[PDB]
């Protein structure tokens, strides 16, 4: 095995049954199928490398923002092995599924993954490490960095060291997981060190706000200055309102013995300070992270912390850079077994909640297979979701093996908690699925579901809920549902379906909101749909409404926020188009009010967080129109 007159090959040690499965699938679907799935010539290390190193001049040729987007060698070492660790992960999942459920089930999953009936997320990591978690910093504050075992670090005594530890933890956790590193209680723990150092005279009183903002700066820029690749780890902050702070931290104490809930007003004030500082800082330099969410308790037409709500509403007026999380209860988070707690891939996941893996069901595929028959549709859907549950159970078993092998110290040190992680049934292409079924229309209010289309979506989501609920008793852990961001999946699934079904599949990309971001429809329709269906996925969705112009008054904005909250929307944001100049100043319009230079790019929420449009398009190009194999003077031989 490994490297094996002339005609050098590389041989991986697969069970013969798996080789036979893969050979049979290639004959059935064709080389193009495997190529589309990333299991074609992507495993050619020589071709991969020669293509990679040649991309620069191509990007310079076609992209005005190439100079900002330019890839360096650190990306090479991350990308080169992804097709190989995906192939390994697919194989290992097949082995585990065969072990648990028999070869029939294992074979069916591999076929569904390759042909696009399902979408295994973070597939290059899937048999190696878990997806995501929203952490509490309590163990960092109390234990230091115990997951780093080659040196013993003392817990922070001061603000500077606390900030260092948080940055290091973020960087560490981002290499132990595929997804977001959430820090919803950051300001709870930062406040402790601000006060401690103030009391001790470490922070001069007359330099208090300066010291605070210096550390805001150090942490925030660190989370937007990537060491490897051209992208920072995905991080989340949450503005916890007074209800959430009181509920989550009831009875909990700081290292000095004081009750955390005795400090609520100070924690709120520090959060407000950050939100204000961040809004100011964007004009100095635009950045993405941490993704901002505010978590508000809202009930019977009222915010229970109206002071915080009006604050968030006010600060958002500038950039609309904060996502609104609305909940009608703090029961799930009270001083944090069937798992309860919001899980959302964009932001707003509750403290100590995560997902070890998402596998998404291709809903348009099922529409294509059903031929318009809604009963047939639901039968296929239920079977697919049952298959996905088995795959998730297998991945969880593999994760447990990795834990036992000492490979995932975030679990050993109690930062990531497996019994606080869902297995996620993802959905995408809800709209396109209904469209193919003949269940969408256009009337005076724009694009919408037909009356039967709405029932159909109800039935789809309710069917998945039922299977998710059954999964708990079946597999001993909790399943959630998410309408996933699908930055790549929305493209690749559409492409696979077009390969298989031709012109029956008319869409270039599948949607990640109940109505497509770029559908011409009345905003009331969007809100109504999110009000109907957000609750069905327990807040695993986002609604974001593009605004042509910022709100004129805080009052107008706030009335809209309350109306959306009244309708039952659980996570939403307003979208503005933010201009940047070549110097990175954020503003609106074509000319920078700071340096007078022209706009060269835009920041926008496309899947739920603010990114440069040039970054979106470059990534989109890389998967949407894959290059044919070409040769030059060297690579022709």
Instruction: Mark the binding-site residues, compressed into ranges.
Output: 119, 121-122, 154, 157-158, 161, 164-165, 180, 210, 214, 217-218, 221-222, 228, 345, 486-489, 581, 585, 592, 595
In this structure, are residues 511 and 435 in contact, taking their beta carbons and an 8 Å threshold? no
Distances in Å between the alpha carbon of 149 and those of 104, 170, 406?
A: 43, 17, 12
- Decide: is 407 part of the binding site for a copy of itself (CB under 8 A): yes
- Decide: is 379 part of the binding site for a copy of itself (CB under 8 A): no
- Decide: is 527 part of the binding site for Zn ion (CB under 5 A): no
Which three-class secondary structure state does DSSP give residue 174? coil
Sign of the four-CA dihedral 449, 533, 320, 229:
negative
In this structure, are residues 480 and 340 in contact, taking their beta carbons and an 8 Å threshold? no
In this structure, are residues 445 and 522 in contact, taking their beta carbons and an 8 Å threshold? yes
Q: Which does 594 bind (CB under 5 to 8 A by kind): a copy of itself, Zn ion, Na ion, none?
A: Zn ion
* Residues numbered 497-536 forming contacts with a copy of itself, rule: CB under 8 A: none
Least distance from Na ion to the Cβ atom of residue 123, Å: 9
Which position among 594, 604, 613, 623 is part of the footprint of Zn ion (CB under 5 A)? 594
- Please report the DSSP string for 568-616 in residue order: T--EEEEE--EEEETT--EESSSB-TTT-PBEEEEEEESSSSEEEHHHH
Binding mask 272-291 for a copy of itself (x = CB under 8 A): -------------x-x----
- Decide: is 617 part of the binding site for a copy of itself (CB under 8 A): no
Least distance from Na ion to the Cβ atom of residue 121, Å: 5
Binding mask 98-137 for Na ion (x = CB under 5 A): -----------------------xx---------------
* Residues numbered 552-591 forming contacts with a copy of itself, rule: CB under 8 A: 583-584
- Decide: is 628 part of the binding site for a copy of itself (CB under 8 A): no
Beta-bridge partners for 293: 238, 323
Q: Where does 330-373 have alpha helices with state H?
A: 363-370
139 vs 347, beta carbon nearer Na ion: 347
In this structure, are residues 440 and 431 in contact, taking their beta carbons and an 8 Å threshold? yes
Binding mask 44-83 for a copy of itself (x = CB under 8 A): xxxx-xx--xxxxx---------xxxxxxxx-xxx-xx-x
The single-letter DSSP state of residue 253 is B
Which position among 63, 101, 153, 314 is part of the footprint of a copy of itself (CB under 8 A)? 153
The interface region with Zn ion, picked from 100-108, 367-375, 446-454, 573-581 by CB under 5 A, is 573-581
Beta-bridge partners for 358: 424
Binding site residues for dATP, as ranges? Answer: 154, 157-158, 161, 164-165, 210, 214, 217-218, 221-222
Least distance from a copy of itself to the Cβ atom of residue 397, Å: 13
91 vs 191, beta carbon nearer a copy of itself: 91
Structure tokens at 473: 């008793």
Strand locations in 269-390, DSSP E? Answer: 291-299, 302-303, 322-327, 353-362
User: Residue 207 and residue 213: Cα distance in Å, rounded?
Assistant: 10
Size of the site for a copy of itself (CB under 8 A): 112
The interface region with a copy of itself, picked from 110-118, 212-220, 434-442, 532-540 by CB under 8 A, is 212-220
Which position among 556, 595, 631, 635 is part of the footprint of Zn ion (CB under 5 A)? 595
Residue with tokens 């998410």: 482
Least distance from a copy of itself to the Cβ atom of residue 130, Å: 10
- Decide: is 228 part of the binding site for a copy of itself (CB under 8 A): yes
In this structure, are residues 323 and 346 in contact, taking their beta carbons and an 8 Å threshold? yes
Q: Pseudo-torsion of CA 91, 95, 101, 106, nearest 10°?
A: 30
User: Residue 6 and residue 80: Cα distance in Å, rounded?
Assistant: 25
Structure tokens at 5: 């007159």
Size of the site for Na ion (CB under 5 A): 2
136 vs 177, beta carbon nearer Na ion: 177
In this structure, are residues 573 and 605 in contact, taking their beta carbons and an 8 Å threshold? yes
Which position among 61, 104, 175, 630 is part of the footprint of a copy of itself (CB under 8 A)? 175
User: Residue 610 and residue 243: Cα distance in Å, rounded?
Assistant: 27
Least distance from a copy of itself to the Cβ atom of residue 160, Å: 6
In this structure, are residues 118 and 109 in contact, taking their beta carbons and an 8 Å threshold? yes
The interface region with a copy of itself, picked from 159-167, 186-194, 250-258, 312-320 by CB under 8 A, is 159-167
Count CA within 13 A, CB hemisphere, residue 133. Answer: 24
Residue with tokens 């499965």: 21
How many Å is the Cα radius of gyration of the chain?
A: 25
Q: Which does 176 bind (CB under 5 to 8 A by kind): Na ion, a copy of itself, Zn ion, none?
A: a copy of itself
Q: Which does 2 bind (CB under 5 to 8 A by kind): Na ion, Zn ion, a copy of itself, none?
A: a copy of itself
Least distance from Na ion to the Cβ atom of residue 390, Å: 21
Residues that bind Zn ion (CB under 5 A): 581, 583, 585, 592, 594-595, 597
Residues that bind Na ion (CB under 5 A): 121-122
């Amino acid at each position: 095995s490994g490297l094996v007159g002339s005609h050098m090959k590389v041989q991986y040690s697969f069970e013969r049954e798996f080789e036979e499965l893969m050979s049979d699938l290639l004959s059935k679907y064709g080389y193009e199928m495997f190529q589309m799935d990333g299991l074609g010539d992507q495993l050619d290390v020589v071709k991969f490398t020669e293509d990679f190193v040649r991309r620069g001049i191509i990007e310079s040729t076609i992209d005005a923002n190439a100079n900002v987007r330019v890839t360096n060698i650190s990306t090479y070492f991350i990308e080169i092995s992804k097709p190989h660790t995906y192939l390994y992960s697919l194989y290992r999942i097949w082995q585990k599924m065969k072990e648990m459920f028999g070869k029939g089930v294992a074979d069916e999953f591999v076929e569904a993954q390759i042909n696009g009936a399902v979408y295994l997320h973070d597939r290059h990591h899937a048999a190696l490490m878990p997806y995501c978690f929203a952490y509490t910093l309590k163990p960092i504050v109390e234990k230091g960095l115990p997951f780093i075992k080659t040196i013993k670090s003392e817990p922070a005594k001061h603000l500077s060291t606390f900030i260092q530890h948080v940055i290091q933890f973020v960087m560490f956790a981002s290499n132990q997981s595929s997804g977001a590193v959430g820090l919803p209680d950051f300001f709870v723990w930062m406040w402790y060190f601000v006060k401690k150092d103030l009391k001790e005279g470490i922070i001069p009183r007359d330099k208090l706000d300066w010291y605070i903002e210096q550390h805001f700066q150090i942490l925030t820029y660190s989370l937007n200055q990537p060491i490897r690749t051209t992208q920072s780890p995905y991080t989340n902050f949450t503005y916890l309102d007074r209800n959430y702070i009181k509920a989550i931290f009831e009875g909990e104490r700081y290292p000095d013995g004081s009750l955390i809930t005795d400090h609520v007003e100070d924690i709120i004030a520090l959060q407000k300070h950050y939100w204000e500082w961040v809004s100011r800082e964007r004009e100095r330099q635009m950045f993405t992270f941490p993704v901002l969410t505010a978590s508000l308790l809202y009930k019977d037409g009222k915010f229970l912390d109206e002071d915080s709500a009006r604050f968030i509403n006010k600060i958002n007026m500038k950039w609309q850079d904060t996502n609104w999380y609305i909940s009608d209860s703090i029961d799930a988070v009270a001083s944090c077994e069937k798992l309860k707690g919001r899980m959302n891939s964009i932001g707003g996941s509750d403290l100590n909640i995560g997902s070890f893996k998402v596998i998404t069901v291709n809903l348009p595929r099922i529409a294509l297979e059903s031929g318009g028959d809604r009963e047939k549709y639901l039968q296929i859907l239920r079977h697919r979701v049952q298959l996905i549950k088995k795959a998730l159970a297998a991945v969880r078993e593999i994760i447990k093996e990795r834990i036992s092998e000492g490979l995932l110290p975030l679990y050993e040190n109690g930062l990531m908690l497996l019994n606080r992680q869902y297995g996620t049934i993802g959905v995408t292409g809800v709209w396109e699925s209904a469209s193919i079924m003949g269940l969408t229309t256009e009337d005076i209010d724009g694009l919408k579901y037909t009356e039967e289309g709405e029932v159909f979506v109800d039935n789809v989501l309710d069917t998945i809920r039922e299977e998710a609920e059954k999964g708990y008793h079946e597999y001993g852990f909790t399943f959630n549902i998410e309408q996933v961001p699908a930055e790549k999946a929305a493209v690749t699934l559409a492409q696979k379906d077009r390969f298989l079904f031709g012109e029956k599949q008319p869409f270039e990309i599948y949607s990640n909101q109940w109505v497509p971001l770029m559908a011409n429809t009345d905003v009331l329709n969007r809100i109504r749909y999110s009000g109907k269906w957000d609750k069905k996925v327990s807040g695993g969705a986002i609604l974001h409404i593009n605004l042509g112009e910022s709100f004129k008054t805080e009052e107008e904005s706030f009335n809209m926020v309350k109306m959306i909250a009244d309708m039952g929307v659980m996570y939403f944001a307003f979208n503005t188009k933010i201009s940047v100049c070549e110097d990175g100043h954020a503003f609106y319009g074509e000319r920078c009010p700071v340096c007078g230079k022209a706009k060269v790019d835009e920041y926008m929420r496309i899947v739920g967080y603010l990114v440069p449009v040039s970054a979106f398009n470059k990534e989109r190009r890389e998967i949407e129109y894959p290059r044919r194999q070409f040769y030059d003077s060297l690579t022709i031989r």
